[PDB]
Homo-oligomer: A and B are copies of this chain.
Amino acid sequence: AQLQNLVLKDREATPNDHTFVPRDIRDNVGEVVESTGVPIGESRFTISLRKTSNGRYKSTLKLVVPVVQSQTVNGIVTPVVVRTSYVTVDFDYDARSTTKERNNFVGMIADALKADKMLVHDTIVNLQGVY
């Protein structure tokens, strides 16, 4: 897994391609950025993999996408983050797990995010409780 581009699609009317491009690796944590050239508007996606002491294999994804409005006056722009959204995924695997297993695992949780998975969607997207 060499640091490279990563292109995520959103759920827009006609899917848009957000293209994060390598920014760097700092302490075994890769960062990829979808940017304009201005650090705060940057939506960043990071990823890491560590083997704990007890021998479990953990890895973490983090995606941060800020919403920023740029006020413009006589030519000078003044960006300001008006709100942000963050999400973190953490896989905890067993040193005896097989690739197939792991894969299916991801597959499942990945699938659980789909828009039609009512139970989930209404919460992660519509912010409704469970009851």
Contact = CB atoms under 8 A, between A and B. Distances in A.
Interface in A46-95: 47-51, 57, 59, 61, 63, 65, 67-80, 82-95
Given A63-B112, A90-B87, A103-B11, A129 B22 contact: yes
A131 B25 contact: yes
Interface in A86-131: 86-115, 117-131
Interface of A: 1-12, 15, 18, 21-30, 32, 35-40, 45, 47-51, 57, 59, 61, 63, 65, 67-80, 82-115, 117-131
A37 B99 contact: yes
A95 to B, nearest CB: 5
Contacts of A10: 103-105, 107-108, 111
Nearest to A112: B8
A70 B119 CA distance: 30
Given A92-B86, A112-B61, A130 B11 contact: no
